[PDB]
Amino acid sequence: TKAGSLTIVGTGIESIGQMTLQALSYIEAAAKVFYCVIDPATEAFILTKNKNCVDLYQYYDNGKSRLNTFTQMSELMVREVRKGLDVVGVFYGHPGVFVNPSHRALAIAKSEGYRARMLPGVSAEDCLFADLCIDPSNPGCLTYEASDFLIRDRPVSIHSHLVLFQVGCVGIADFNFTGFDNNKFGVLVDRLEQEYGAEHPVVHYIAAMMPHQDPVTDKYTVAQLREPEIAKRVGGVSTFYIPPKARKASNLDIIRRLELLPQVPDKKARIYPANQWEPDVPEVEPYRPSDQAAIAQLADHAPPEQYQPLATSKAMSDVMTKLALDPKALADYKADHRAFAQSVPDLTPQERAALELGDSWAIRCAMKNMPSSLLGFPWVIVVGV
Amino acid sequence: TKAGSLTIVGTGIESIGQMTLQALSYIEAAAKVFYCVIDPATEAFILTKNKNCVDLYQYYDNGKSRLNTFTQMSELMVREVRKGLDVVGVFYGHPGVFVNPSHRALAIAKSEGYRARMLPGVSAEDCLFADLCIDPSNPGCLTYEASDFLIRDRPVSIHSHLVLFQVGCVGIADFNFTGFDNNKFGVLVDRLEQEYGAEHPVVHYIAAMMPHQDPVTDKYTVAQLREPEIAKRVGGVSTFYIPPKARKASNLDIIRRLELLPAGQVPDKKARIYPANQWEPDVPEVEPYRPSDQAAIAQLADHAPPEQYQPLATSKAMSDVMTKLALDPKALADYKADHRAFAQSVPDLTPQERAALELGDSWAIRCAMKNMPSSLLDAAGFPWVIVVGVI
Ligand SMILES: Nc1ncnc2c1ncn2[C@@H]1O[C@H](CSCC[C@H](N)C(=O)O)[C@@H](O)[C@H]1O
Ligand SMILES: Nc1ncnc2c1ncn2[C@@H]1O[C@H](CSCC[C@H](N)C(=O)O)[C@@H](O)[C@H]1O
């Protein structure tokens, strides 16, 4: 209804390649783009995609509080929204993961009646999971800002993953172009010693920011973090991963209520692969007899009766791709399902009808051959069950 | 050295749009693609990008254990890696977030000496942060699988975010094509009642999976989850977000050791930075435009970039090659095999650009692409972009 919109998007962490297709498409469609990114290749890429970009990084300064910068960053965006423009804000990683001005700008825009949306992106923690070869689900994940972790005395779980952002600027909220001496780092190390012990591993993690670089995945003990030359290596893009100390046992009452015992595996017994960063992690066999038996079944395998093969058309595939990749086409479609579906070339009557309704079932039926036996979407992990 | 590679990538959650540019480029370059995705439009899109794709979803079956399915999915990928092929596995969301077979296949490939890598993608949790307008940093975030949360009695923190995946299939291991009756959902609700109380908010979250759908962001009390009509809305793609019950106080020792005080004038524990979490019970109104915010905005008119600001100053040739290294996996592989041979064959690079590319060091590339001023010098300060209770 009201003219003007704010869409905030991410670039991901690794230069260019970790931007989403939809983030790119909004950057291209925007009347004005405001960006804060860490590497010049991503900045240059963004400038080739829109003619009206502004670098938000220029609003930082030595001894200027970050809060004032953030207020300024968000106001620049919201000013253009108020004039009736389609504005896009672009931030490093995921634009709402450890980011102030994005949330501020969106909330102001939203409260004043403008269309406001954040699109998700790939965060440093997403990269961490990928590079450290860990799954947040096994055995759970605690994520904190390092200074917050200390100041508010946030609880750890020695049985779950712990991830700490901003380990290289403990207790420091000022800006400097030279960065800071991380003088209060020792206060974090003391907390980690207390919680985990001096010999427990800490993984210093830095995701590759350029496509050709390797990530930093350096295991240290908590005690090694006291060494000057090791502590020196922690900076503004450093994140700490601390693996579990031990494995949590199963609760008998829950086993009973969930009907899992008629037995349950030992707490030490694992599904391959085991977390390689955990201390005293045993070797897990990737090819047990049950695995070999399942692999033997591949030779005679046919799709089950209830499997739904894709059965769509170029015309339908094109329109669904266009709706995902063309914000203007999506907006037209959302404004009038029927008028949009009428104007799409080469659709079958079923495809047209499904697009007219817009319901997920109708579109699925149009694109997937549903067998008789069917008429259960793949959550793709098992835990200790 | 050894022929063959495995790259596992994600599609993100929302159909097509939430795939990363690098995920797409690897799907296109692969000799063989194996995929497991939820929606047919993403499936169709993948099939237009590579001519040799296999749907891994066909290896599920009624009454066949998920572990066996996962062993099979992994082996189909690794078999092609061992034939010397560049193999790409594709999974919904982030391919290592609540996914078994990706980690298995990568670990096997890596242990047998093949190139193995996971590329991150947008997870259901990433979507949740974006759609619910919360930041995991404020006030921390605990993320669990719902059945694991119950079975291993995982700790909640009433002062931090809690996110629970798989709340629509509590205690269910099996596979069925028609989905499952979430009969043990009451076991979860009891635990949430114990931890938070009957009147505490639980946000039922479903990210939009097609570009035109709206997300489900439905707030219920814990008690409301006991109603049959409410409970039945929770399905296989449902996630719960449970907001903080209260705000945690600062401790004096850390305040002192971090030297964050002249006198007792740290903000009160509830004096939040705008905006406040709208899902928290008894969330106070936070003023977006305090006097200090207005003073900051007033400085915009006379603003110029600081001396030490580094304007972009690159070339078409350099932005093109850096873009190509990000979007062309074959070009990246060549560049990594021999920095100098690659750099010297790139057309139209300046001497500095060529030299920076020959070295490959981030600083050399940065200095080739940005005008680093005298003011900045070379100490030999990048924008981490949140503050907590420090200001
Ligand atoms: N290349 C990298 N590797 C590891 N952690 C990183 C990183 N870049 C940023 N971070 C983490 O993020 C903090 C900056 S806060 C901004 C994070 C960004 N919005 C995101 O989605 O990740 C850093 O202090 C660090 O903890
Ligand atoms: N559209 C959606 N909205 C909210 N949560 C979702 C979702 N799709 C999947 N999930 C969550 O993820 C679980 C499946 S497990 C696979 C998750 C996927 N790899 C990811 O990166 O998120 C579901 O039980 C649900 O908790």
Numbering used by the authors:
A (entry chain A): 7 to 268, 271 to 383, 397 to 406
B (entry chain B): 7 to 386, 397 to 407
What does the study report here?
In addition, complexes R72A-SAH and Y76F-SAH show similar active conformation of the substrate peptide. The structures of R72A and Y76F with SAH do show the active conformation.
While chemical methylation of an amide bond uses a strong base to generate the imidate, OphA, the precursor protein of the fungal peptide macrocycle omphalotin A, self-hypermethylates amides at pH 7 using S-adenosyl methionine (SAM) as cofactor. Omphalotin A derives from the C terminus of the OphA protein, and it is the OphA protein that methylates its own C terminus using S-adenosyl methionine (SAM). The structure of OphA reveals a complex catenane-like arrangement in which the peptide substrate is clamped with its amide nitrogen aligned for nucleophilic attack on the methyl group of SAM. Here, we report the structure of the peptide amide methyltransferase OphA including complexes with cofactor [SAM and S-adenosyl homocysteine (SAH)], cofactor analog, substrate, and product.
